Amino acid sequence: PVKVWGSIKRLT
Amino acid sequence: PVKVWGSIKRLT
Amino acid sequence: PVKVWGSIKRLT
Amino acid sequence: PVKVWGSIKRLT
Amino acid sequence: PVKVWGSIKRLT
Amino acid sequence: PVKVWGSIKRLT
Amino acid sequence: PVKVWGSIKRLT
Amino acid sequence: PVKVWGSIKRLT
Amino acid sequence: PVKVWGSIKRLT
Amino acid sequence: PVKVWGSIKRLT
């Protein structure tokens, strides 16, 4: 499986 | 800020 | 930034 | 297998 | 086999 | 055999 | 963009 | 950018 | 979009 | 043999 982790700042 | 985490098993 | 890593066995 | 590595900055 | 190559910039 | 061709531009 | 190409002998 | 490379033996 | 075309043989 | 033609991801 491909795992992802973290956070972005602006949605658009 | 939007936190992102999880996993994908298929590409497309 | 969202870190991504891993491998997939099937395309679709 | 299809390997993935890196980070995304954009959600959409 | 099905070969893949490139990079993704956006999550979805 | 079944041939494949195209492109994925999004991760999920 | 991730390019996809090749051939598979069975769909599953 | 998330780098993607490799090969898969089955489509679905 | 991923295009698919060809013929399907069996394991026999 | 059983021939196939089309796309994995339907367009509009």
Torsion of CA G12, D3, I3, F5, to 10 degrees: -120
CA E8 to chain centre: 6
Residue in C with minimal Cα distance to E10: C2
Task: Give the three-class secondary structure for F12.
Answer: coil
DSSP SS3 for G11: coil
Closest CA to H6 of D8, F12, I8, D5: D5
Asked if C11 and H11 touch (Cβ cutoff 8 Å), the reply is yes
Question: Do the Cβ atoms of B11 and C11 come closer than 8 Å?
Answer: yes
Cα Dmax for chain F:
28
Question: Is A4's CB within 8 Å of B1's CB?
Answer: no
Q: Which residues contact I12 (CB under 8 A, 6 or more apart)?
A: none
Do residue I9 and residue G9 have CB atoms under 8 angstroms apart?
yes
Option in I2, I5, I7 nearest J2 (CB): I7
Measured CA to CA in angstroms, residue E5 lies from F8, F9, J3 at distances of 10, 11, 27
Whole-angstrom Cα Rg for chain G: 9
Q: How was this structure determined?
A: X-ray
User: Rounded to whole angstroms, how far apart are CA atoms G5 and H11?
Assistant: 11
**What's the reported resolution, in angstroms, to a tenth?**
2.5
